[PDB]
Specification:
part of a larger assembly; 2 chains; A: mainly beta; Methylamine Dehydrogenase, Chain H; four-stranded antiparallel sheet; 2 helices; globular; B: mainly beta; six-stranded mixed sheet; about 40% strand; binds 2-acetamido-2-deoxy-beta-D-glucopyranose; membrane protein
Chain lengths: ~375, ~650
């Protein structure tokens, strides 16, 4: 059961992105950007030629970047101009799905940097160092589906989830998680000087009854006491989708200990995925290995629960820990027209119909649902 | 004539503005004084002290690209306010490493290192140029090289990672750590044409040009048109175009190798030495294989279309679109020649001077005319060993009357004008050599700096005045032209006057002047190696050699110099006739024979040859009885008429081929 109150726009404005910046909702739409907070929907127009606003990251001010008519360009929050004139790798050249995260002041994104569009995963210039980019064909043309930053004890690391499409005898999709060192310095050489030197990846695995799911929809890493737990949502070309959970501690341990797939010899002293003390640069042997064989000979198996299967075609999902109990969540996952909630404790799924073209669910303290009608806020 | 001999063949050479001449020979890189006398300093890149080439490099066919270990060597930032100049040197060793260093005492610490900057394949091409780019005008370095060569042995793996596999041009930054290349600061490649060989890189009108040509390092044959890739002079590669250069005029299959390049700066004219595949060393070496072609930089700048022919573009596929436009050289200037190896163009007194280096140790300069028409080249200097001139000539920066000719393993500093042979005005002024002018105070044809010691500038009469403007006697007699002093004394024989005054004599304070149909078949022609002094007797064998009155032989060596037209000496048997060839310059002239009337019958090539210098005598001593076949090793022995043994003379036989004979 769910009662949602609707703060709608004046018109049905095609949603293009939704972000949470310090419990303030930033809904990038065509034309303006909407700002939800305290049930207050402040719309701010920027331009309207094409200008699909897609990015609303926060570095120092929450700058907001869009694509004004095939030219990507940023702004300050209130339509003002960006001092640093950011905007190349911050917004796509055309309306697309993006993945752009911002740590302290360090923007990482998969957004296309040029017009042609070779897919790469980049960290842009800032406190971490100069720009970086993954070698080609590493990131699939579909893009990076999830990205989040997590401590590795002492060094920040960036994790990204994507779905590769291998094609040898038949096309097989494979879900991957990939780790990189947030403060990587680049490779050793001059050509490989702006390339990640700590990029590694493992296959995930979400099997239930011999049906293995392989297409990532969306991810979210909740931070708990002993470690953080990663919730992935897989879709399938069949009529099903499946939420799995993985223990980031198990993943980190696997990254640090497992062996590189296809590489049989002894791994060098600064082990490939390992972060390095500030200013250090990966040697050449380690880098040659880490670029040739960048996949561990392993497979991350999910936690025991909650694995569950919902409909096919879910688009978003967000978690909200129940205030009464603890480590028991309500996972609100959203389809084009129908809300669904799932309680990790009772393992029952509730549903609800809503006559709108939903786009996302965000959760700050109460699930707010971003649909083309406008925003809604939910109370059961 | 100061020479500096290295031990291994020169790999590169640059000349700093005020810090001497850097020469990268083997594993070691030396710096010398502009007089090429003392190695002021020296760096060892591979191993200390021992700077022998780690591996052996085969000096290949003169048309084929050479090989070395010092890919990049270029000074920059020199002549700054207080900042001492820098020298950027990139070697094959260490995966094609490149270090910035202070331009000066070589044994100082390299400021910034960097790996995979230059091609680490000793026979791979590399050409770089620094420039100003960025929001703060840093010094960037655009490097075009042959990074990936399909010759990797499992022992050592040069070829960079699979991401940087098809990289041709990269815009390194000389400030970032290890000379970092941006993501977009690199220009990819199309993998179909084999490899590319880049010859040069220069800036012109806000852009960088890379003259290259496709090439098969395995085969050894060009696989396409010599082209020029034009890139925007920025921080990220902005491919602005590519244009092929069509210098195959005067040769059947065309000239598809680019042997050397040079941008005539003040004229906005590129000048390139093209050649066709000359078999194996010299087997298809024709009278027209090499050709100096001049292109207007404006035409290349305008005709270069961004087509994905050799380089990947973001808007097409490899060779799935237009073909690059073929730019035509300045027609009135192309100089055909049997063996050309290097070019260097400059402008002095508003006249283009193109020094050229031939594959037989000649440095000969041409002076372009009014409509950039080439004159017949004067031979400036000749290397006694006929070693092929290294493909880069560097002008002395501190004395603009010298140039540093590199050849094999020897560098030397030679003047740019052999004006001591001119003894009069006209000889000094009709030759139209811009560097040379008449000098009254000395009364000699000399450079400017060698005779502007008298402050009255008109003492050193140059060519811009005109050849007629030297002093002469005019009839009521007077002096005409441009004299240095305004006071003289005339004396005729016997009226005398003084000064601008009035046998005839005009004496000055520093100098003086005084004055009182059937067929016609050609079997062959012999010999085919005539020495430079000509040959009195060249036998042409054929048929029906008596059914004709006026039979002529026309030799043409250089598409600019005139033709040697001669009549038959004494018409022998209707199968044989005999000619007499005069002196000429070392060349490989084409020989047509035109009978009483008609087209020329091209009998075949005929090469003048340098005089035979005598290297060594194998036994060097034999018993007074003699009879031991003394062996003499030398060069150009095949052209020897015969031998003399002077002590009384003794005629003795000879059994010889090109290089040696007993
Ligand atoms: C929304 O706009 C009103 C209009 O002035 C302003 O008073 C209010 O502070 C704004 N709230 C946010 C969260 O931007
Ligand atoms: C110099 O080093 C090369 C390395 O290949 C070696 O072959 C040569 O013998 C060395 N010469 C001396 C004098 O050390
Ligand atoms: C170069 O520096 C070294 C280092 O001390 C010194 O020994 C040498 O004399 C210097 N040579 C020149 C020409 O400056
Ligand atoms: C190569 O770079 C490293 C890093 O600074 C430096 O220690 C080393 O001296 C460099 N090598 C040369 C030959 O300059
Ligand atoms: C020409 O180049 C291609 C590609 O590099 C190579 O496969 C081929 O062998 C070369 N030609 C010869 C005669 O080897
Ligand atoms: C220099 O480049 C500009 C850029 O378009 C061009 O218009 C101009 O013609 C160039 N200069 C010459 C002399 O061609
Ligand atoms: C013609 O005479 C020359 C010598 O003058 C001789 O070598 C040649 O064999 C003769 N040929 C014929 C066909 O008689
Ligand atoms: C000594 O005799 C050998 C025998 O062939 C010869 O090659 C050499 O030139 C002679 N003279 C020397 C070694 O000075
Ligand atoms: C002397 O040697 C040369 C080649 O070395 C040979 O052609 C010649 O016939 C020899 N003479 C005698 C008399 O053996």
């Amino acid at each position: 059961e769910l009662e949602i109150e609707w703060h709608k726009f004046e018109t049905s404005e095609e949603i293009i992105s939704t972000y949470l910046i310090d419990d303030v909702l930033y809904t990038g739409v065509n034309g303006a950007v909407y700002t939800f907070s305290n049930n207050e929907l402040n719309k701010t127009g920027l331009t309207n030629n094409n200008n699909y606003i897609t990015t609303s990251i926060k570095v120092e001010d929450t700058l907001v970047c869009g694509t004004n008519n095939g030219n990507p360009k940023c702004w300050k929050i209130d339509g003002s101009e960006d001092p640093k004139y950011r905007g190349r790798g911050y917004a796509p050249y055309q309306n697309s799905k993006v993945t752009i995260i911002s740590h302290n002041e360090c923007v990482l994104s998969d957004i296309n940097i040029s017009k042609e569009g070779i897919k790469r995963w980049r960290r842009f210039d800032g406190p971490c160092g100069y720009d970086l980019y993954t070698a080609d064909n590493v990131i699939p043309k579909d893009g990076v589906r999830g990205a989040f930053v997590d401590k590795d004890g002492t060094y920040d690391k960036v994790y990204i989830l994507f779905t590769d499409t291998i094609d040898t005898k038949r096309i097989v999709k494979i879900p991957y998680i990939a780790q990189m060192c947030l403060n990587d310095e680049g490779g050793p050489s001059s050509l490989s000087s702006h390339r990640w030197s700590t990029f590694l990846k493992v296959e995930l695995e979400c099997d239930i009854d011999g049906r293995s799911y392989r297409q990532i929809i969306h991810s979210k890493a909740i931070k708990t006491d002993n470690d953080t737990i990663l919730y992935v949502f897989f879709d399938s070309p069949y009529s099903k989708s499946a939420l799995c959970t993985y223990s980031m501690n198990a993943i980190k341990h696997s990254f640090s200990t497992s062996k590189l797939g296809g590489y049989t010899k002894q791994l060098p002293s600064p082990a490939p995925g390992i972060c390095l003390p500030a200013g250090k640069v990966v040697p050449h042997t380690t880098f040659d290995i880490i670029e040739q064989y960048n996949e561990l000979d392993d497979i991350i198996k999910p936690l025991s629960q909650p694995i569950f299967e919902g409909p096919s075609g879910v688009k978003w999902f967000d978690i909200k820990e129940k205030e009464n109990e603890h480590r028991e969540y309500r996972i609100y996952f959203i389809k084009e027209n129908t809300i669904y909630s799932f309680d990790t404790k009772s393992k029952q799924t509730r549903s609800a119909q809503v006559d709108a073209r939903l786009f996302s669910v965000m959760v700050t303290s109460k699930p707010l649902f971003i649909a083309d009608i406008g925003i809604g806020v939910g109370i059961p | 004539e100061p020479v500096w001999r290295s031990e291994q063949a020169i790999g590169a050479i640059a000349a700093s503005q005020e810090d001497g001449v850097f020469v990268a020979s083997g594993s070691c890189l030396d710096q010398l004084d502009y007089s090429l006398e003392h190695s002021l300093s020296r760096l060892y890149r591979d191993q200390a002290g021992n700077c022998t080439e780690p591996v052996s490099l085969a000096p290949p066919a003169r048309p084929r690209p050479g090989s070395s270990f010092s890919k990049l060597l270029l000074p920059y930032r020199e002549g700054a306010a207080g900042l001492g100049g820098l020298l950027l040197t990139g070697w094959t060793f260490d995966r094609g490493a490149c270090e910035v260093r202070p331009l000066g005492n070589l044994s100082r610490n390299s400021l910034r290192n960097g790996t995979e900057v230059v091609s680490c394949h000793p026979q791979g091409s590399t050409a770089g140029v620094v420039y100003r780019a960025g929001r703060n005008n840093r010094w960037y370095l655009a490097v075009a090289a042959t990074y990936v060569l399909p010759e990797p042995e499992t022992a050592s793996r040069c070829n960079p990672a699979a991401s940087d596999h098809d990289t041709a041009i990269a815009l390194k930054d000389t400030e970032g750590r290890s000379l970092a290349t941006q993501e977009l600061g690199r220009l990819k490649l199309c993998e179909g044409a084999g490899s590319l060989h880049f010859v040069d890189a220069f800036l012109w009108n806000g852009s960088i040009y890379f003259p290259y040509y496709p090439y098969n390092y395995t085969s050894g044959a060009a696989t396409g048109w010599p082209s020029m890739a034009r890139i925007a002079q920025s921080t990220e590669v902005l491919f602005q175009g590519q244009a092929s250069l069509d210098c195959g005029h005067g040769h059947p299959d065309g000239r598809r190798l680019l042997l050397s390049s040079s941008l005539v700066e003040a004229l906005d004219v590129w000048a390139g030495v093209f050649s066709a595949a000359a078999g194996e060393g010299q087997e298809r070496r024709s009278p027209t294989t090499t050709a100096l072609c001049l292109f207007r930089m404006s035409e290349i700048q305008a005709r270069a279309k961004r087509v994905s022919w050799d380089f990947k573009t973001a808007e097409s596929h490899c060779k799935e679109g237009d073909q690059p436009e073929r730019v035509q050289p300045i027609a009135s200037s192309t100089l055909i020649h049997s063996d050309l190896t290097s070019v260097y163009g400059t402008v002095v007194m508003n006249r283009t001077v193109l020094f050229l280096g031939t594959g037989d140790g000649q440095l000969l300069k041409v002076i372009l005319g009014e409509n950039l028409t080439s004159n017949c080249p004067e031979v400036i200097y000749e290397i006694k060993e006929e070693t092929p001139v290294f493909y880069k000539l560097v002008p002395d920066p501190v004395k603009n009357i010298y140039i540093y000719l590199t050849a094999g393993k020897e560098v030397r500093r030679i003047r740019v004008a052999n004006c001591n042979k001119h003894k009069s005005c006209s000889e000094c002024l009709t030759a139209t050599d811009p560097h040379c002018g008449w000098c009254h105070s000395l009364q000699r044809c000399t450079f400017q700096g060698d005779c502007v010691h008298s402050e009255n500038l008109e003492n050193w009469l140059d060519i811009s005045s005109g050849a007629k403007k030297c002093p002469k006697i005019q009839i009521t007699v007077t002096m005409v032209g441009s004299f240095s002093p305004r006071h003289s004394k005339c004396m005729v024989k016997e009226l005398c006057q003084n000064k601008c005054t009035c046998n005839v004599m005009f004496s000055f304070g520093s100098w003086n002047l005084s004055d009182r149909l059937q067929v016609f078949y050609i079997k062959s022609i012999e010999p085919q190696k005539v020495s430079t002094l000509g040959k009195s007797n060249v036998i042409v064998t054929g048929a029906n050699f008596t059914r004709a009155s006026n039979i002529t032989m026309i030799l043409k060596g250089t598409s600019t110099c005139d033709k040697d037209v001669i009549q038959v000496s004494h018409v022998l048997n209707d199968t044989h006739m005999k000619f007499s060839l005069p002196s000429s310059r070392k060349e490989m002239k084409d020989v047509c024979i035109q009978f009483d009337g008609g087209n020329c019958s091209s009998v075949g090539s005929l090469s003048y040859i340098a005089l035979p210098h005598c290297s060594l005598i194998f036994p060097a001593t034999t018993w007074i009885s003699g009879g031991q076949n003394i062996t003499m090793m030398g060069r150009n022995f095949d052209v020897i008429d015969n031998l003399i043994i002077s002590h009384g003379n003794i005629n003795v036989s000879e059994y010889c081929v090109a290089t040696y004979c007993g």
